[PDB]
From Swiss-Prot, chain B:
PROSITE patterns: NUDIX (PS51462), NUDIX_BOX (PS00893). Mediates the hydrolysis of some nucleoside diphosphate derivatives. Its substrate specificity is unclear. In vitro, it can use NTP, dNTP, 8-oxo-GTP, 8-oxo-dGTP, dGTP, dATP, dTTP or dihydroneopterin triphosphate (DHNTP) as substrate. Has some NADH pyrophosphatase activity in vitro; however, such activity may not be relevant in vivo due to the high concentration of manganese used during the experiments. Plays an important role in protection against oxidative DNA and RNA damage by removing oxidatively damaged form of guanine. It comes from Arabidopsis thaliana. This is Nudix hydrolase 1. One of its GO terms (cellular component) is cytosol. A motif (Nudix box) lies at residues 36-57. The gene is NUDT1. Its main location: cytoplasm. The lineage of its organism: Eukaryota, Viridiplantae, Streptophyta, Embryophyta, Tracheophyta. Has the ability to complement a mutation of mutT in E.coli and thereby completely suppress the increased frequency of spontaneous mutations. One of its GO terms (biological process) is DNA damage response.
Length: 139, 138
C-alpha cells in the first residue's frame, strides 16, 4: 500500500557490471542488478554490501551513492511501488567471482561490458540507461 | 518499523531557499524544508508540489531531482527511518508569499539566503550541506 525502498548495486569491474536474470513475479527473466530491500536502521552502504553478499557471495567496498529512481509497478499481480537507490561499488579482492547464492531469485550472475549489455533489461534499468545514465562517469 | 520515503523540496527563490522551524517529536524547533510522505503510485515531482501546496500554499514548477539521503532517527520516541528524496523547484510567481498552512507542524516559513542560513538546521539537512551539496548548482 506504500512505497518501499530498495538498494541496487552497480559493481564496477573493469568496464563491466554484474547482472543476472530475475526469477520473480515482477520482471521475470529480465536482467537486473544485485540488491534488495533496505532494512530498518540500515545505511545505503551497509544494505548494498549485505545484499550483494547474500545474493552473490562477493565482498564489495567503497560504496558511493549514484541516484534514485521511482518505480511504480502497475501491472504487477499485487501492485507495488519501489524507490530504488543505486550504489556503485568495487570488489575488495579483485580475483573474486560470483556465486548464485539465491537460485530461487536469480538464474545466475555474470559480468557484462557496459557497451555490450544483455537484453532484455529489467524495465526500470532500461529506462535509467535510456536517459543517458552511466555509472562509470562519476569518478 | 520500516524505511519510509519522504520528499523534501528546495524552493529556489533568487539566492534563497524556504525553511521553517519544525514542531515535531523529531528535530523540534530546527529549520527544515517543506516536504512530506510519498504516496503510493505518486511521482517525486507530484509529491513535491502536493506537499508544498499542503504546507505553504505556494505554487511551484520546474521540479528536478537532486539527491537522496538516509535519515535514521534512533533517538525518537518511536524510532523512525526516512529515506529523503530532495527536489529543486521554483515559484511560478516569484512574488507569492508563503502561508503557515499546518501550524501544528511548523512555526512558519521564511526565505533564507544561501550564504546566511539559519541555525540550527535539521541535522539531516546540515549533514547534507556539510558534504558540499549545493541545490543551486547540483
Ligand atoms: Mg575503470
Amino acid at each position: 500500500a506504500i512505497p518501499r525502498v530498495a538498494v541496487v548495486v552497480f559493481i564496477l569491474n573493469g568496464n563491466s557490471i554484474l547482472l543476472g536474470r530475475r526469477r520473480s513475479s515482477i520482471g521475470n527473466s529480465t536482467f537486473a542488478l544485485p540488491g534488495g530491500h533496505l532494512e530498518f536502521g540500515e545505511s545505503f552502504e551497509e544494505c548494498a554490501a549485505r545484499e550483494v553478499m547474500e545474493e552473490t557471495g562477493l565482498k564489495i567496498e567503497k560504496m558511493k551513492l549514484l541516484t534514485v529512481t521511482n518505480n511504480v509497478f502497475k501491472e504487477a499481480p499485487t501492485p507495488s511501488h519501489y524507490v530504488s537507490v543505486s550504489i556503485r561499488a568495487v570488489l575488495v579482492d579483485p580475483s573474486q567471482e560470483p556465486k548464485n547464492m539465491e537460485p530461487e531469485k536469480c538464474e545466475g550472475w555474470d559480468w557484462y561490458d557496459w557497451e555490450n549489455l544483455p537484453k532484455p533489461l529489467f524495465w526500470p534499468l532500461e529506462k535509467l540507461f535510456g536517459s543517458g545514465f552511466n555509472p562509470f562517469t562519476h569518478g
